[PDB]
Symmetry: D2
């Protein structure tokens, strides 16, 4: 079975090749986006593997079918990229990443927190040139502080586990309180309490129409001066204009954000008939204790191996049968 892989990054290739040892496919790696124009490159491949920015609508799918491709595989969860009606109709079998790694994500959140806290990113900038000055690097001791987690699904609980290790007082907000969280000693509270009492706040929840801009001006008003905020969840959970103001006011002490790729563009705000919006990343990073990562939360070897492992197992079946539920039918 021959698989064409689009939007390939070096990490994608490394892990796919390693996982492929136990499936045996012939792999062809392309660094470029799958588009209507590039679909033809798949010719000769029974299948293609795509990621969040690849184009999966009918026009692309038509080209693929024309070129003999049967199976499409997302190394991925987000599908706003693909036009799913067509595939079934075109006789084209399909999939995504159902399982994902909660620990990788939680750990990333913690890592962002610690880096910000101890200003380790800044320290590195200095010490890489043998500048050992400590001015401006002072952090806070975690132990005995209060941590507020918004959302107690697997990721949120994984985070709480770590925060418990730090010896923090643990608070949480979730509409659906979890035994797993209670067993850790977490106290579930309303948002207002969480905002009021938390030294560190971390978002681990899905975006809903209800929680759009959950962290807004009113919310910031409730928080402690110098509060640390981490968002490895969707960008829309935070009103960016309000966060910017709160940073300027010094209400927010530190802010860490893992930026989703198709939110990067709409990230954001002011511009005067200027200046969309890499400028915001630059300014905040320079002027505040603000740290951005580029949707990096799942970027560990173990997490990547898991994504790969499956991707191959699915195709191997498809190359012959199963439910899948690789398959989205």
């Amino acid at each position: 079975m021959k698989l064409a892989v689009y939007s390939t990054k070096q990490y994608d290739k490394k892990y796919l090749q390693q996982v492929n040892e136990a499936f045996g496919f012939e792999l062809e790696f392309f660094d470029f986006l799958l588009t209507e124009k590039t679909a033809k490159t798949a010719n000769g491949c029974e299948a293609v593997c795509i990621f969040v920015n690849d184009d999966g609508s009918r026009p692309v799918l038509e080209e693929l079918k024309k070129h003999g491709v049967k199976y499409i595989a997302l190394r991925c969860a987000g599908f706003n990229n693909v036009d799913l009606d067509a595939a079934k109709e075109l006789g084209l079998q399909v999939v995504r990443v159902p399982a994902y790694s909660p620990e990788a994500v939680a750990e990333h959140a913690i890592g962002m927190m610690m880096t910000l806290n101890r200003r380790i990113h800044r320290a590195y900038q200095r010490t890489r040139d043998a500048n050992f000055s400590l001015e401006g690097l002072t952090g806070f001791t975690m132990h005995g502080k209060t941590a507020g987690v918004i959302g107690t699904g697997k990721i949120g609980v994984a985070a709480l586990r770590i925060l418990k290790g730090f010896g923090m007082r643990l608070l949480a907000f979730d509409p659906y309180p979890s035994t797993a969280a209670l067993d850790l000693g977490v106290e579930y509270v309303d948002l207002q309490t969480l905002f009021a009492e938390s030294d560190v706040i971390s978002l681990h929840c899905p975006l809903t129409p209800e929680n759009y801009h959950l962290l807004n001006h009113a919310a910031f008003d409730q928080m402690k001066n110098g509060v640390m905020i981490i968002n490895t969840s969707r960008g829309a959970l935070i009103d960016s204009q309000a966060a910017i103001e709160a940073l300027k006011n010094q209400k927010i002490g530190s802010l860490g954000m893992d930026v989703y790729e198709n939110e990067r563009d709409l990230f954001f705000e002011d511009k005067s008939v200027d200046v969309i919006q890499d400028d915001v990343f630059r300014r905040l990073s320079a002027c505040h204790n603000v740290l951005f990562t580029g949707h990096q939360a799942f970027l560990t070897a173990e997490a990547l191996i898991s994504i790969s492992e499956t991707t191959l197992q699915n195709l191997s079946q498809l190359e012959k049968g199963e439910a899948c539920p690789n398959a989205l039918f």
Copy 2:
């Protein structure tokens, strides 16, 4: 009483002043080093407060006494910079802060680990300029990995609590196994075992003649390829020449080191007629997944407050003629 503070940094001043509300000393802050030449600036203070780089040799002490100084407070644990015998003969009293907050230090070790693991230091260099490329940033999932801690005093135990939080398998080496550790599910093992099995290793122990160059060529050879090593303990725990080789060979995956001041200028071991360093810090940082911090482990507000409280409390006892448990001699 009036206190002259030398080698003053902004953090030193902020926390000393804040703590001093409870004490009422008259504080005078100097940014420069105490030396034989600057000792005269103390004139009119009964006490001086110094840090690791300040010069406490006999000639300095002699000048201080000449100028009416009775008391010397080290706002740090180390005292090798001060000639204690001379101080005793001269009638001076010397006091110190015997330990730093264990939690602050452990948390710093963990922070170095995570920053290294996820290459967060590298990411920032990118994203500060709006470059979101992930190439080279790939880390490891901590959960289920094995952590080995060498030394289970308060700092090591504090680290172990955090590591337990990550859901790691916890191994340790210490001559005197601690119930507090055992209570965490820690398994104590010999060094050979700890070296063979640990994905991450962190040093939380005093330097002894016995453990000089504990992490040496034989130790590295034993370790897992890609191992992460953290040292917030003294530098001599590690044979640097061996570490540098291990990095080159890709035995050591990641290395984080909190570099003590009295220990930076001294890497050698060795070279010829051209030429030496801060170069090693620059090269390693550039070429490997290596992070140095400048003795930053105790640099938190809470830890600095503790240091400030102890220091003023020590001074307060000396002023009164009350025996000070933090005195370095009679």
Copy 3:
């Protein structure tokens, strides 16, 4: 005519589109490399435009021919990536940009030199973080120093003009002395003399069998301690190992190199027992007063406009059947 542009960077696109206002080509821009696999994307185009990394080997050319391509335009001087014998046989026509703007390249060399001299690159690393320390930034006054230029073709002469403006003594080495250089007041000399007396040295010459490793251990021995060396010419002009030792020795004070794409892996050092050969860039940049740029010497709007005009003109001449002096056969 419709033209497919491969390996497209934003700058390529901006200037090609700007220039095309005068030509009316139909332009299709691709970000990815031209390869045997991607050559099919050119279907519908009479021409393609490529750069130094694109693959112009016979298998690729065969694909392009099958797909209706007639013309290949190199938006660069180099053509090592294109198999000219094959192209001829296949009836394809190949054109290039014969030279870059001399002023742009010369200015880049001077820019490198001044940045290094005043450690401006270092200063920015500091001041971007509001660190105004000057330690380690001391340079040298150019006025009254001696510059040596190796090669006095158009670029070398442009460089000399600038150097003259700094109030420097001008020396040069060329086997074929130039009237414009002589008219400027340049004194031609032997290499040994140029090495012995030059404060600053800049390489502006083509690579030849003769000058391979022209700057070698013996050359570095003859130089002044603290000498500044600039190479915007090909990498092989310098023996890297020697250069590395000379930096380590402190014979070479400063080194600036504009690194050619194809020559990127070749250079430099021992090196690494496999990946990565990039570490040399990292090491030298951190440990010494060394500056690398990525073949940036022609990267000005004006130079890019010239490349764009030449390319579109070359293509019109081809279509019209006129003689194209830029043709590679």
Copy 4:
């Protein structure tokens, strides 16, 4: 004579020592600031050498006198930190370095220009990590563009020579004409014309009432979109609020500023109310093609040697009872 040197940086020491080979002063170097408190450190010295940040006010001067100092040498042009009246009254003599090497300053201005033009500072941040991407680095060819110099004293003229070498067309605004400049082919013009026609502008003039905020909203409006501006002259030549707005609007393509020690606050936006700040420097540097240097324009070995010779020579003349042209009063 023994000379105490305050606020010493490694470069000050190196060049002062090198020059002293021919003078034989006895030199004592202090890294710290001269203040009322540290003036006593000078006892045993007839002279002290100070720089722009050192405290020269009456109380300090009084201390110096008490401690036997007769001479104060400024290793710089500015002297606003020194209370000249008090000095004269106290019987102290003060000398300065009247001007920096014109070539060094002009060369600095050109260096900033080229670095900004080709985004070499950005490039280095990339290539230091083997990132050879060229996106965003595109510059412009200098040759055939127009350069406008504001001020045609020795520095402006030195800059013109260089700019001439680039093949640029030379414009200048100075009320007063320069033989050297005319001789160079320069065209004098009014400010409005200089503003309209210049691709690059560099300021090389002293601050006067007449040019306070010379580059103001109105001036920027006249300028070419994308224009490059360099200021190695004093800050108040530019209305910073107007400049910042002009950067935001994209009227100014690039801005290079050598920032005087005494002037960090001149440059401001702003709404960083909490709390008044170096933030402007961090922000502009990140968001625009902006480059700051810390009053670096004279930082070359030759320029420093000149400062050093002048300073030692002033001191020598003072010792002699000779007329020092560089004295600030008599």
